[PDB]
Amino acid sequence: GITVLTHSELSAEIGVTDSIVVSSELVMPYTVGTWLRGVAANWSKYSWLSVRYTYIPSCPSSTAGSIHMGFQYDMADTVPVSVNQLSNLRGYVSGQVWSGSAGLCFINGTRCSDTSTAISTTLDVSKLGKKWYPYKTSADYATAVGVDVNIATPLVPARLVIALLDGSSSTAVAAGRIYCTYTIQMIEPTASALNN
Amino acid sequence: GITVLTHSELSAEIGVTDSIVVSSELVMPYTVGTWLRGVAANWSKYSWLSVRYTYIPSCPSSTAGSIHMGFQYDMADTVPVSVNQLSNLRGYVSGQVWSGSAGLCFINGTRCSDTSTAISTTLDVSKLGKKWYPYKTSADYATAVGVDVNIATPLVPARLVIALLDGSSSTAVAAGRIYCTYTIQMIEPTASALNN
Amino acid sequence: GITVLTHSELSAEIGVTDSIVVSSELVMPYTVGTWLRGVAANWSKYSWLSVRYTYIPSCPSSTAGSIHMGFQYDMADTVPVSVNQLSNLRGYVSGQVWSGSAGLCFINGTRCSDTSTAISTTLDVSKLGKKWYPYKTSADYATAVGVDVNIATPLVPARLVIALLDGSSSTAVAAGRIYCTYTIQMIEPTASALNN
Amino acid sequence: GITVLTHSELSAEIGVTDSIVVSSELVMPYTVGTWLRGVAANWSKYSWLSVRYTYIPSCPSSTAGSIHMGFQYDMADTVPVSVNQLSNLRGYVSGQVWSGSAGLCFINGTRCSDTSTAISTTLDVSKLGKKWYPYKTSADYATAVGVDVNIATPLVPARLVIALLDGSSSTAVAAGRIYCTYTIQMIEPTASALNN
Amino acid sequence: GITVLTHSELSAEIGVTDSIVVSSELVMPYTVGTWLRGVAANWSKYSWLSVRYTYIPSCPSSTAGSIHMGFQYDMADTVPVSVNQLSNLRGYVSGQVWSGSAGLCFINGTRCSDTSTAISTTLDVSKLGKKWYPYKTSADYATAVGVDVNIATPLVPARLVIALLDGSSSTAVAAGRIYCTYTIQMIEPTASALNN
Amino acid sequence: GITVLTHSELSAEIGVTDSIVVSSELVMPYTVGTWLRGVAANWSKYSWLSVRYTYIPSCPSSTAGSIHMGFQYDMADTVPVSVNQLSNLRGYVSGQVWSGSAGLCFINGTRCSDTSTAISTTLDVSKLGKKWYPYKTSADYATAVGVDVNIATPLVPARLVIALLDGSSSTAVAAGRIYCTYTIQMIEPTASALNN
Ligand SMILES: [Ca+2]
Ligand SMILES: [Ca+2]
Ligand SMILES: [Ca+2]
Ligand SMILES: [Ca+2]
Ligand SMILES: [Ca+2]
Ligand SMILES: [Ca+2]
């Protein structure tokens, strides 16, 4: 009954400043990207066989700035506020805002070697709370965590925190973007209009 | 420490009308039937090794009407409102309100062939959120989902939605009933009076 | 790059009259049903590994009428106008409008024996014009066949013709419905909004 | 990515009275003891490979009183109020408040035989709701169960209930203490200051 | 009767601006490049055994801008208008307008490792509508798709969409170029003057 | 479901003049000959396993003239206008209008050696656009190619071009005729009256 799908897709646009800016995104079908969001909605539950966020630059080699990424699993835990804190995280990766080209290898699905420089990171998957999660809409999710944060752990596996700093301008400068490459198993189809 | 039990039991009386009527029932010890409800209460948690709802007719071959069944897993998802929507569901089955006799095979535990006509359906079990669930009383459950629906997924594996239409009368006509046949593992006994 | 999916879904509601009524439906993702229509749209092309239309009754054993189904492959060919003509078709099946319950076996995915009575039929698949077809929207398709019918063969594998007669009333009487059970391979994902 | 750790530590001081006194403690890193509490906080989630509470006496052979222990898994379930109820629990153990010396064997990690007399009990672990749980602080936990109890099952595996009675004084008499011996797997490190 | 040929050739000059510019090119002998266009014309039909478009930079490391490429198969489908949409496409690749040097490996036919950074992408080939396509002249093709777009799928396997943005000037800045490396099978020779 | 048939049949009468005369004929059931035309119409689609046009003389050894034959696959391509152009074609054959007797071997199905002199030619079949083609009536075909030529490639595999010249009279002189020997697979039967 399992429908397995592997695909890459744009997940977020990245810009730099001269002051650190920490953000985060849930690691669930609905939020990884528009495409998977629409597809996944047609199935009741799902499971991450592999999820990897990989950053790809679009700026010049002269661009000042650096990106940092990591994973958190207990949505109740407070989000990092410094590179130091973020560096403690699982799957922490760091690199110049203009580096990370070698990450393409992954997005392309193509097999490659020169990956050392890649600003890409993967999820535990085998160490997530459970295997099969329910497809949630940010709206429904939001309401739940509104009652209480912990109501989220049974709804989502983890979040990806992102930090950007070391830029030269106080006004965001487009550096590149984060693509999400995933292999997901979708199960128990449902009329999409009913999936919340 | 596992106490395994296999048993069939009456789960619901079914009637037909000339207008569709969609209903649903949680797939947990407490709600499948009175018998299992009393037994299961004596154990802290449990696990579905196999759960199957099978419809058995009691009306004449001339009885107008049809039954439809399917499963939903994210209690937050909205319940189907049409046969079309219900038909998208996992384990969807459909049939004349007077057909479904061959389903007896299952209830009886007896091994049989002529099952094609059976209006019976089984649960994923291996694809449920988790394996071991806590025994809940509808009352306690109700309160929880009252705070927020999602508080339910860690409490129950799935719900069975049922649709009845194509009847000849606008006044319910007894068509037959739905029996539940299950093989459950019960663990961590408790004084029943304490189980909520 | 192939995403394989197996699923059943409601395809059409069936009613009977005392005069023959021939209809037909394209055998492509967009038209088989609402569910697959939405899912499939997210992929550029696709391929039928298995497609079967199976009729399921909802009326009483006393219901007068009979259903007939078959396949046509050259959309330019004219649609049958009689049971005799339809009976010549590939995969022609015929049966009482109240028979066909054993077909459930197929929809359920469950393995079964007592299939002889089933009013279900399957597509050649291996004998279709080609293997991979482009996902089309009825609108876009319509326009094309408007210029010329033959512009369709490279767009769709086949059509299912349906005939209903031998009813007792001159006013349609709900007999049952046709579900479509398919195993489809979807390839070359695309933003759904762009798929025409 | 798993950091495995085995260790024993003081979990609670025990005293007796002439009237029964039932208490309970969550079986999670934060509450088992001060040591593990500090260590475990440095990791996002964790898993119990083995948890055992073992009672060790400190009183004279002449000391009147008896201790009782057991496990509950559905925090919503009401806590036992009698030895009879408690005796139904999983892993129930009972013994004279001055007996239980042989339990040392376990705390010491040392391999031993004369264990029959040991007032020690172990957790299901394999039968817990899930394997990997999130590190929670009693404060955060408290808030959650404040909204609703069930919000706890996805946060904690089980609780240990303790009953003390048969003492000679109505004023607590120090009998001994409960040590916790565990083998825990900690994963997905985090800055401790962020763990809630 | 098959004449197999492997060769690389310039396919398009690339320039950047500060506003996105989406373009596309058919993936057929006539349009991949002048050389293959002349050669292929001498044969009635042909087949892509391997087609890969690889971008090679010519600008300085300081050049602002990024390129994006992907494939579409149903010429009727509307062309992407954003990087997000394009990122959903099959074989989507993205990278800094000054990166992509490692792609040379491919053009050169030479075997190499450090390919991760390569801004190169390959065609499905095995998943194309059919294997053998007819050699078409853009003129003849144009006329056909003029009557109706769908008349194209039996004429061409796919199109390559290209997007360029993140540049520093509103006036195109030469960034580099796209070369096409292909291994084509040509069959059923014809006097070139007759091939339309 | 495949009905395989092997048969030879008269395809065209041939005459010579002192000026070249180029003609062509579609290679589809409907046009190869009257017999196959009637038979094939009873089936929806078909496939050429083997098709060979072989010329047989009926004139005296003193008859001036020569015949030329070849195949074209892209109906949009312009028809040859000279022997030189025709000679470039796939399966080009040439010979004296009074030679070609040895071709009988083929028509007869009989196995023979002295074939060198045979003015017979065979189709690629394995290199055709696709395997299964739809049975078309010249009328319906004509209409389609009227809208646009390319609408034909998905309708027919190829055409046979014929050139006759080197005759002694400016008034056609009966030289011989072209027979078609084929092994065709017919599938998906249909009432002939409906086949267009
Ligand atoms: Ca949902
Ligand atoms: Ca309970
Ligand atoms: Ca399309
Ligand atoms: Ca935590
Ligand atoms: Ca051509
Ligand atoms: Ca036809």
| Closest listed ligand to the CA of F138 | 6
The DSSP call for residue A78 is P
Please tell me the distance from the alpha carbon of residue D119 to that of residue D114, in angstroms, as a whole number: 12
Q: With an 8 Å Cβ cutoff, are C34 and A4 in contact?
A: no
The DSSP call for residue B194 is G
| Closest listed ligand to the CA of F144 | 6
Burial class from Cβ neighbours inside 10 Å (0-12, 13-18, 19+) for residue D170 reads exposed
Q: How far is the CA of E46 from the centre of ligand 5 (A)?
A: 10
Please tell me the distance from the alpha carbon of residue C10 to that of residue C180, in angstroms, as a whole number: 6
Cβ atoms of C99 and B110 within 8 Å: the answer is no
Q: Which residue of A has its CA nearest to C191?
A: A35
Q: Which residue of B has its CA nearest to D73?
A: B44
Please, which experimental method was used?
Answer: X-ray
Chain F contacts to C (CB-CB under 8 A): 1-2, 44-45, 130, 132-136, 140, 143-144, 147, 151, 154-155, 187-191, 193-196
Please tell me the distance from the alpha carbon of residue E15 to that of residue D76, in angstroms, as a whole number: 66
Please tell me the distance from the alpha carbon of residue E180 to that of residue E186, in angstroms, as a whole number: 17
Beta strands in B117-169 (DSSP E): 119-122, 133-134, 159-165
Tokens matching residue C161: 């013709």
Instruction: Report the candidate in C51, C53, C49, C52 with the shortest Cα–Cα distance to residue C4.
Output: C49
Neighbours, chain D (3 or more CB pairs < 8 A): A, B
Please tell me the distance from the alpha carbon of residue B14 to that of residue B8, in angstroms, as a whole number: 17
Q: With an 8 Å Cβ cutoff, are E196 and F74 in contact?
A: yes
Non-local CB neighbours of C46 within 8 Å, separated by 6+ positions: C29, C40, C132, C133, C135, C184, C185, C186, C187
A133 SS3 class = strand
Measured in angstroms, the CA of B145 and the nearest CA of chain D are apart by 10
Q: Choose the mutation target among D135, D149, D190, D195 for the interface with A, i.e. most A CBs under 10 Å.
A: D190
The DSSP call for residue F168 is S
Measured in angstroms, the CA of E151 and the nearest CA of chain C are apart by 6
The HSE-up count of residue C187 (CA atoms within 13 Å, CB side) is 22
D122 DSSP β-pair partners: D52
What is the identity of the amino acid at D122?
Answer: T
The DSSP call for residue E62 is T
Size of interface B-D (CB pairs under 8 A): 83
Please tell me the distance from the alpha carbon of residue B41 to that of residue B189, in angstroms, as a whole number: 9
Interstrand relation of A133-134 and A3-16 (parallel, antiparallel or unpaired) = unpaired
A192 SS3 class = helix
Element (H, E) at F30: helix F29-32
Burial class from Cβ neighbours inside 10 Å (0-12, 13-18, 19+) for residue A146 reads exposed
Convert D32-60 to b/e letters by CB count within 10 Å (16 or more is b): bbeebbebbbebbbbbbbebbbbbbbebe
Please tell me the distance from the alpha carbon of residue D15 to that of residue D31, in angstroms, as a whole number: 19
Angle at Cα E33 formed by Cα E28 and Cα E37, nearest 5°? 65
Q: With an 8 Å Cβ cutoff, are B166 and C174 in contact?
A: yes
Question: For chain D, how big is the Rg over CA atoms in Å?
Answer: 17
SS3 content of chain E, % helix, strand, coil (to 5): 20, 40, 40
Q: Which residue of C has its CA nearest to A1?
A: C6
Tokens matching residue E9: 């050739």
Give the Å distances, CA to CA, from B50 to B75, B126, B128, C112, D130: 20, 9, 12, 19, 20
F140 is in an annotated binding site: no
Sign of CA dihedral D125, D131, D137, D138: negative
Q: With an 8 Å Cβ cutoff, are A44 and B72 in contact?
A: yes
Give the Å distances, CA to CA, from D37 to A105, D28, D137: 42, 9, 9
Q: Which residue of A has its CA nearest to D156?
A: A150
Non-local CB neighbours of B148 within 8 Å, separated by 6+ positions: A143, A144, A147, A151
F102 SS3 class = helix
Please tell me the distance from the alpha carbon of residue A29 to that of residue A38, in angstroms, as a whole number: 9
Total residue count of chain B as it appears in this document: 196
Please tell me the distance from the alpha carbon of residue F92 to that of residue A164, in angstroms, as a whole number: 69
Structural domain count, chain F: 1
C99 SS3 class = coil
Other C-beta atoms lying within 10 Å of the C-beta of residue A62? 12
Please tell me the distance from the alpha carbon of residue F20 to that of residue F56, in angstroms, as a whole number: 19
The DSSP call for residue E117 is T
F192 SS3 class = helix
Non-local CB neighbours of F180 within 8 Å, separated by 6+ positions: F8, F9, F10, F11, F32, F33, F36, F51, F52, F53, F54
Element (H, E) at B105: helix B104-107
- Supply the DSSP string of B18-42, one letter for each residue: SS-EEEEEE-SHHHH-HHHHHHHTT
Please tell me the distance from the alpha carbon of residue B166 to that of residue A182, in angstroms, as a whole number: 44
Cβ atoms of A43 and A186 within 8 Å: the answer is yes
Tokens 């990450």: give the residue: A103
Give the Å distances, CA to CA, from F187 to C17, C71, C120, F33, F47: 33, 12, 20, 19, 8
Cβ atoms of C101 and C58 within 8 Å: the answer is no
Tokens 């006013």: give the residue: C171
Tokens 């095995």: give the residue: E126
User: Which chain E positions have a beta carbon within 8 Å of C136's beta carbon?
Assistant: 74, 76, 150
Tokens 């239980």: give the residue: D100
Element (H, E) at E38: helix E34-40
Helix ranges (DSSP H) in C48-174 = 83-88, 104-107, 138-147
Q: With an 8 Å Cβ cutoff, are A5 and C3 in contact?
A: yes
Q: How far is the CA of D54 from the centre of ligand 2 (A)?
A: 26
Convert C22-31 to b/e letters by CB count within 10 Å (16 or more is b): bebbbbbbbb
Please tell me the distance from the alpha carbon of residue D186 to that of residue D175, in angstroms, as a whole number: 34
What are residue C182's phi and psi, to 5 degrees?
-140, 155
Please tell me the distance from the alpha carbon of residue E48 to that of residue E27, in angstroms, as a whole number: 9
Residue F196 has its nearest CB partner, among C77, C84, C90, at C77
Dihedral in degrees, nearest 10, Cα atoms F110, F115, F120, F121: 100
Instruction: Report the candidate in A146, A149, E46, E190 with the shortest Cα–Cα distance to residue F161.
Output: E190
Instruction: Report the candidate in B195, B185, B181, B194 with the shortest Cα–Cα distance to residue B10.
Output: B181
Cβ atoms of C128 and F132 within 8 Å: the answer is yes
Convert A4-26 to b/e letters by CB count within 10 Å (16 or more is b): ebebbbbbbebbbbeebebebbb
User: Which chain A positions have a beta carbon within 8 Å of C35's beta carbon?
Assistant: 42, 189, 191
Instruction: Report the candidate in A114, A112, A99 with the shortest Cα–Cα distance to residue A62.
Output: A99
Resolution (A): 3.3
C193 SS3 class = helix
Q: Choose the mutation target among F27, F68, F72, F90 for the interface with E, i.e. most E CBs under 10 Å.
A: F90
CATH number at residue F123: 2.60.120.20
Non-local CB neighbours of B178 within 8 Å, separated by 6+ positions: B10, B11, B12, B14, B53, B54, B55, B56, B69, B162
Convert B154-193 to b/e letters by CB count within 10 Å (16 or more is b): bbbbbbbbbbbbbbeeeeebebbbbbbbbbbbbbbbbbee
Cβ atoms of E48 and E122 within 8 Å: the answer is no
Please tell me the distance from the alpha carbon of residue D72 to that of residue D82, in angstroms, as a whole number: 14
Please tell me the distance from the alpha carbon of residue E196 to that of residue B106, in angstroms, as a whole number: 67
Domain coverage including residue D124: 1-196
User: Which chain B positions have a beta carbon within 8 Å of D78's beta carbon?
Assistant: 193-194, 196
Interstrand relation of A43-57 and A173-189 (parallel, antiparallel or unpaired) = antiparallel
Sign of CA dihedral E49, E55, E58, E61: negative
Burial class from Cβ neighbours inside 10 Å (0-12, 13-18, 19+) for residue E40 reads buried
Q: How far is the CA of F192 from the centre of ligand 6 (A)?
A: 9
Interstrand relation of C173-189 and C3-16 (parallel, antiparallel or unpaired) = antiparallel
Please tell me the distance from the alpha carbon of residue C52 to that of residue C32, in angstroms, as a whole number: 10
Cβ atoms of B166 and B66 within 8 Å: the answer is yes
Beta strands in D62-137 (DSSP E): 66-72, 90-96, 119-122, 133-134
User: Which chain F positions have a beta carbon within 8 Å of C73's beta carbon?
Assistant: 44-45, 134, 188
Instruction: Report the candidate in D171, D158, D133 with the shortest Cα–Cα distance to residue D21.
Output: D171
Please tell me the distance from the alpha carbon of residue E3 to that of residue C61, in angstroms, as a whole number: 66
Tokens 């601006």: give the residue: E17
The DSSP call for residue F97 is T
C29 SS3 class = helix
E71 SS3 class = strand
Residue F196 has its nearest CB partner, among C78, C124, C147, at C78
